[PDB]
Design a protein around this ligand. Structure first.
Ligand SMILES: *[C@@H]1O[C@H](CO)[C@@H](O[C@@H]2O[C@H](CO)[C@@H](O)[C@H](O)[C@H]2NC(C)=O)[C@H](O)[C@H]1NC(C)=O
Ligand code: NAG
Ligand code: CA
Ligand code: CA
Ligand code: MG
Length: 260
C-alpha cells in the first residue's frame, strides 16, 4: 500500500484551472492509495471538487476524500485534504486536535492537525491514524515537538498506538538547525521512527532541505513499514520536466512510503 504527503504550493482555483498543471498534479496523486495534500487555499471547496473530478475522470469512485475546514491564525487559511482509493482503504472518522486557546494567542499550532483514522484490509496494520502537519516555519521546533502531545491525544481518543505523523514539518535548513533536534520530543522519544532522513531533499527548488517528513509509531504500523521505502518523489526528474514547469507544480516534492 502506498501513502504520500504533498505540499502543493497555494493549491486552489488557479492551479486547478490550468490543464497542464492539473495533468501533472493528477499524475502524481494517482500514484498513491492515500495522499495528504497541504496548502489547500479553497474557501468554497470548488478546487477540491475539480481535483476529484479529474482524479475520477475515467472511473467514478477511483478516489474519495476527506477535507478539513480552513485552518490558520489569520489569512491565508489552509485545509488539510486526504484523497484515497476507497477500494483500498476506508476513511473511518476524524477530529480536530485541541491545541489550546486561539483567541488568547496561546494555542500551539498555526494549523492544528485534522487527524483522520483509516482502515486498510491489505496491510499488516488494519487500523491506523494519520496526523497531518504543515508547520509554521518560524515555529517549527515547537510545533514538531507538540506533535508528541498530539500522539498521546490520539490514544486518548481512539485507543490507537498506530499513528503516522507526516507532512511539511519544515524540519530542516534554517527552520530547524542541526542542534535544535534534542528540543523535539517527537524526535528524542524512541516511540517514533523517522522514516524520511535528515539528508533528504524534499524541495522542488535548488535548495536541499528535508522539510517534509514521515514519522511512525505503534507495533503493528512500524512492522508494516517497508524499511527504506520512505523517499521524496522527485517528479521533475521522474517526468523529465524543466525547472520552470516543475516549480509551477509546487516548490515541494511529495514524500511517499510503502506499507506491507
Ligand atoms: C498553465 O501553466 C503553464 C506552466 O506554468 C504556463 O505555461 C508557461 O507560461 C509561462 C509564462 O507565460 C512561460 O514562461 C512558460 O514557457 C510556459 N510553460 C510551459 C510548460 O508551457 C501557462 O501560462 C499556464 N496557462 C495559463 C492560461 O495561465
Ligand atoms: C493563555 O492565556 C490565558 C489567559 O491569559 C491563561 O489563563 C492561560 O494560562 C494561558 N495558557 C497557557 C497554556 O499558557
Ligand atoms: Ca492553532
Ligand atoms: Ca531541492
Ligand atoms: Mg509553502
Amino acid at each position: 500500500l502506498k501513502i504520500a504527503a504533498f505540499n502543493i504550493q497555494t493549491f486552489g482555483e488557479t492551479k486547478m484551472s490550468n490543464a497542464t498543471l492539473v495533468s501533472y498534479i493528477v499524475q502524481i496523486l494517482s500514484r498513491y492509495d492515500i495522499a495528504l495534500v497541504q496548502e489547500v487555499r479553497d474557501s468554497h471547496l470548488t478546487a477540491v471538487g475539480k481535483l476529484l473530478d479529474n482524479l475520477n475522470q475515467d472511473a467514478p469512485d477511483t478516489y474519495h476524500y476527506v477535507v478539513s475546514e480552513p485552518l490558520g491564525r489569520n489569512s491565508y487559511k489552509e485545509r488539510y485534504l486526504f484523497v484515497y482509493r476507497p477500494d483500498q482503504v476506508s476513511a473511518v472518522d476524524s477530529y480536530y486536535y485541541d491545541d489550546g486557546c486561539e483567541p488568547c494567542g496561546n494555542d500551539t499550532f498555526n494549523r492544528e492537525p485534522a487527524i483522520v483514522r483509516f482502515f486498510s484490509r491489505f496491510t499488516e496494520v488494519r487500523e491506523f491514524a494519520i496526523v497531518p502537519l504543515h508547520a509554521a516555519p518560524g515555529d517549527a521546533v515547537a510545533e514538531i515537538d507538540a506533535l508528541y502531545d498530539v500522539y498521546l491525544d490520539v490514544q486518548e481518543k481512539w485507543g490507537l498506538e498506530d499513528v503516522m505523523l507526516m507532512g511539511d514539518f519544515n524540519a530542516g535548513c534554517s527552520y530547524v538547525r542541526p542542534s535544535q533536534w534534542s528540543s523535539i520530543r517527537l524526535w528524542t522519544s524512541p516511540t517514533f521512527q523517522w522514516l524520511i532522513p535528515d539528508s533528504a531533499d524534499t524541495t522542488a527548488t535548488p535548495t536541499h532541505c528535508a522539510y517534509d517528513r514521515i514519522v511512525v509509531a505503534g507495533m503493528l504500523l512500524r512492522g508494516a513499514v517497508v524499511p527504506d521505502s520512505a523517499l521524496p518523489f522527485n517528479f521533475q526528474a521522474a517526468y523529465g520536466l524543466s525547472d520552470q514547469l516543475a516549480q509551477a507544480i509546487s516548490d515541494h516534492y511529495p514524500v511517499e512510503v510503502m506499507l506491507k
